[PDB]
């Protein structure tokens, strides 16, 4: 196994002629009238001027945006997913029918699974288990296969999202790992194509480039091509808090290492990353990322992700030094398609406490309902006798309780039923196995509004003795609320 953070052996140095390069170099391509396949849609991404957000924050300059979400897969990684493969295919490293294994979650695995789906490669994406249903559904739809690795297990560990991919690589015939962190094809893709597009579209003239930093291939290749052909251009790198990628190290000091923004920042310094071509670094957080993302979507009509928001949130700061007549280009990595249920959802933004909006009987208290005396069950009775009673009284449940009255959980009918479809339970065995812990608990002193929210969300909430959370005062559903309302109106 080789470490991705292993120091770079590249001898490239500013001033060295391009004739000395040992690598293979491609060029931006004239696109056909009719595309032979969807993969030809990758590249030649549009440059869109930012008209509102630039001026709103007082930028005297021109602010352009390089939109990589118009790539066939809806991310910048479609550039490298193509390149890394097209190189391997040339090298003789990659054969027809082979397997491509990658230790990635969502941003590269999509591009790779797409290219693999088009060209008939088996694709194996290895990642933690709780991966967002958007990315996971896209991958499964493209034909890729997923390996769930444990949520808590280290990078250096033998059971992680990465090491296990290497174990599969060794164990599975014809399997290859392109290794986006170590592969020179990653930054060479942007060095050869992206940076040339940016230079063509800007007529060779721009005074700043702002990019968010992930593996680092993008910002590296771009900054190198620019430093060569456009010296005056300053390169600005963006790093989330909790990441050590940014320089100097003093900026990297923080309490938590966890952030909600996807695609940028992780704990190690990849091989492909060149931090000597980055003129200045900026620290962003999740709040301004998502805020500026919503602002981009709303004001500019640009459908993009949170990393784009980070990039721009930094841009409005870094471009203040720029005056009138100059130009600043930002990199917008991906689309909103992956974040449909995350930063795009107001409920989610509220839950994490980012925007946190404010909130005739709405402020009336649940107490006014005057509910029934609960039917609770022992963990220990059969599922048959269980749904026998729940059929008798037309109630759907239990707080599942111990002998002391302590709540051990809850159980509902539908849960039982799906547990039966899976065949993991049968009427004989104890109900204590089917305990449903994923419901929500709210109680007497709570507002009827929050309850209402849960009632359009779920089937029920659970009134607990106010100051004893292990105690059950009663069970609330929509029918008793409708009872209250229809009663006093």
Ligand X SMILES: Cc1ncc(COP(=O)(O)O)c(C=O)c1O
Ligand Y SMILES: C[S@@+](CC[C@H](N)C(=O)[O-])C[C@H]1O[C@@H](n2cnc3c(N)ncnc32)[C@H](O)[C@@H]1O
CB of 395 to ligand Y, least distance (A): 4
Indicate which of its own copies, ligand HEM, ligand Y, none lies near residue 16 (CB less than 5 to 8 Å, by partner kind). Answer: ligand HEM
User: Would you count residue 271 as binding ligand X (CB under 6 A)?
Assistant: no
Output phi, psi for 175, to 5 deg.
-90, 140
User: Would you count residue 421 as binding its own copies (CB under 8 A)?
Assistant: yes
Q: Enumerate the H helices of 195-237 as residue ranges.
A: 195-201, 217-229
User: Would you count residue 236 as binding ligand X (CB under 6 A)?
Assistant: no
The SS3 call for residue 227 is helix
Other CB atoms within 10 Å distance of the CB of residue 370: 10
Residue 162 or 330: which CB sits closer to its own copies?
Answer: 330
Whether the Cβ atoms of residue 140 and residue 161 lie closer than 8 Å to each other: no
Whether the Cβ atoms of residue 463 and residue 473 lie closer than 8 Å to each other: yes
User: Would you count residue 153 as binding its own copies (CB under 8 A)?
Assistant: no
Q: Enumerate the H helices of 40-176 as residue ranges.
A: 52-56, 77-91, 109-119, 133-142, 163-171
Other CB atoms within 10 Å distance of the CB of residue 282: 19
Q: How many residues bind ligand HEM (CB under 6 A)?
A: 21
Exposed, middle or buried, 270 (CB in 10 Å: 0-12/13-18/19+)?
A: buried
Which of 220-228, 278-286, 292-300, 335-343 is the region at the interface with ligand HEM (rule: CB under 6 A)? 220-228
The SS3 call for residue 127 is strand
> Could you give the string, one character per residue 411-450, with x where binding to ligand Y holds by CB under 6 A and - elsewhere?
----------------------------------------
- Euclidean distance between CA atoms 276 and 257, whole angstroms: 24
CB of 305 to ligand HEM, least distance (A): 24
Binding residue for ligand HEM, selected from 271, 284, 291, 386, defined by CB under 6 A: 271
10 annotated among ligand-binding-site residues: yes
Distance of CA 55 to the CA centre of its chain: 30
Whether the Cβ atoms of residue 187 and residue 272 lie closer than 8 Å to each other: yes
Whether the Cβ atoms of residue 176 and residue 99 lie closer than 8 Å to each other: yes
Q: 171: part of which helix (H) or strand (E)?
A: helix 163-171
- Euclidean distance between CA atoms 58 and 14, whole angstroms: 34
Cis peptide preceding 193, ω within 30 of 0:
no
**In the beta sheet, which residues pair with residue 419?**
none
Which of 166-174, 209-217, 316-324, 398-406 is the region at the interface with ligand X (rule: CB under 6 A)? 209-217
Indicate which of ligand Y, its own copies, ligand X, none lies near residue 397 (CB less than 5 to 8 Å, by partner kind). Answer: ligand Y
Residue 54 or 333: which CB sits closer to ligand X?
Answer: 333
HSE-CB for 350 with a 13 A CA cutoff: 8
Q: Which of 475, 382, 365 is nearest to 429 (CA)?
A: 382
202 annotated among ligand-binding-site residues: no
Question: Interface residues for its own copies in 365-394 (CB under 8 A)?
Answer: 383-384, 387-388, 390-391, 394
Whether the Cβ atoms of residue 174 and residue 380 lie closer than 8 Å to each other: no
Tokens of 390: 């729940």
Which of 217-225, 315-323, 358-366, 421-429 is the region at the interface with ligand X (rule: CB under 6 A)? 217-225
Which residue in the list 33, 52, 60, 77 is annotated as catalytic?
A: 77
CB of 84 to ligand X, least distance (A): 12
User: Would you count residue 375 as binding ligand Y (CB under 6 A)?
Assistant: yes
310 annotated among ligand-binding-site residues: no
User: Would you count residue 398 as binding ligand Y (CB under 6 A)?
Assistant: yes
Q: Is 77 a residue of the active site?
A: yes
Which of 34-42, 102-110, 186-194, 419-427 is the region at the interface with ligand HEM (rule: CB under 6 A)? 186-194
User: Would you count residue 309 as binding ligand X (CB under 6 A)?
Assistant: no
Indicate which of its own copies, ligand HEM, ligand X, none lies near residue 218 (CB less than 5 to 8 Å, by partner kind). Answer: ligand X
Counting every residue written for the chain, the total comes to 489
CB of 489 to ligand Y, least distance (A): 19
Whether the Cβ atoms of residue 279 and residue 235 lie closer than 8 Å to each other: yes
With a CB cutoff of 8 Å and minimum separation 6, the contacts of 76 are 68, 218, 331, 333, 334
Residue 246 or 401: which CB sits closer to ligand X?
Answer: 246
Q: Can you tell me which residue has the tokens 């805020």?
A: 291
Which of 46-54, 101-109, 173-181, 250-258 is the region at the interface with its own copies (rule: CB under 8 A)? 46-54
Binding site for ligand X (CB under 6 A): 76-77, 106-107, 212-219, 262-264, 305, 307, 333-334
Binding site for ligand Y (CB under 6 A): 371-372, 374-375, 394-398, 459, 475-477, 479-480
Binding site for ligand HEM (CB under 6 A): 8-12, 16, 18, 20-23, 182, 184, 187-188, 191, 220-221, 224, 271-272
Summarize the annotated binding site for pyridoxal 5'-phosphate as residue ranges. Answer: 107, 214-218, 307
Summarize the annotated binding site as residue ranges. Answer: 10, 23, 107, 214-218, 307
Tell me which residues are annotated as active site.
77
């Amino acid at each position: 196994w080789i470490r991705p953070d292993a120091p770079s052996r590249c001898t490239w140095q500013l001033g060295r002629p391009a004739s000395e390069s040992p690598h293979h170099h491609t060029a931006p391509a004239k696109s056909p009238k009719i595309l032979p396949d969807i993969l030809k849609k990758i590249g030649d991404t549009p440059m869109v001027r930012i008209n509102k957000i630039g001026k709103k924050f007082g930028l005297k300059c021109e602010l352009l945006a390089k939109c990589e979400f118009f790539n066939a897969g809806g991310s910048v990684k479609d550039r490298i997913s193509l390149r890394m493969i097209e190189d391997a295919e040339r090298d003789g490293t990659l054969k027809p029918g082979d397997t491509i294994i990658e230790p990635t979650s969502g941003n590269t695995g999509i591009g790779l699974a797409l290219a693999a789906a088009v060209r008939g490669y088996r694709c194996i994406i290895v990642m933690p288990e709780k991966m967002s249903s958007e990315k996971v559904d896209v991958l499964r739809a493209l034909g890729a296969e997923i390996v769930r690795t444990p949520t808590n297990a280290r990078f250096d560990s033998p059971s992680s999202h990465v090491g296990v991919a290497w174990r599969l690589k060794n164990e599975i015939p014809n399997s290859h790992i392109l290794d986006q962190y170590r592969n020179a094809s990653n930054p060479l893709a942007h060095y050869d194509t992206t940076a040339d597009e940016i230079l063509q579209q800007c007529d060779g003239k721009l005074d700043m480039l702002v990019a968010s930093v992930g593996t680092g291939g993008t910002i590296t290749g771009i900054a190198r091509k620019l430093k060569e052909k456009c010296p005056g251009c300053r390169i600005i790198g963006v790093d989330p808090e909790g990441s050590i990628l940014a320089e100097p190290e003093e900026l990297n000091q923080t309490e938590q290492t966890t952030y909600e923004v996807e695609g940028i920042g992780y704990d190690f310094i990849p091989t492909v990353l060149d931090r000597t071509v980055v003129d200045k670094w900026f620290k962003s957080n999740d709040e301004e990322a998502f805020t500026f993302a919503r602002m981009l979507i709303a004001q500019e009509g640009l459908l993009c992700g949170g990393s784009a928001g980070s990039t721009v949130a930094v841009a409005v700061k870094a471009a203040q030094e720029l005056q009138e007549g100059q130009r600043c280009v930002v990199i917008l990595p991906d689309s909103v398609r992956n974040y449909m249920t995350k930063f795009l959802s107001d409920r989610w933004m509220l839950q994490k406490g980012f925007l946190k909006e404010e909130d005739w009987w709405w402020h009336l208290r649940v107490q006014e309902l005057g509910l029934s005396a609960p039917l609770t069950v022992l963990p220990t009775i059969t599922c048959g006798h269980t749904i026998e009673i729940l059929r008798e009284k037309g109630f759907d449940q239990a707080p599942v309780v111990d002998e002391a009255g302590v709540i051990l959980g809850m159980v509902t009918l539908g849960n039982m039923l799906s547990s039966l479809l899976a065949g993991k339970v049968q009427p004989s065995d104890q109900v204590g196995k089917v305990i449903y812990k994923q419901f929500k608990q709210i109680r007497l002193t709570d507002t009827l509004g929050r309850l209402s929210h849960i009632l359009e969300m779920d089937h029920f909430a659970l009134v607990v003795h106010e100051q004893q959370r292990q105690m059950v005062f009663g069970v609330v559903t929509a029918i008793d609320l409708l009872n209250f309302v229809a009663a006093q109106e």
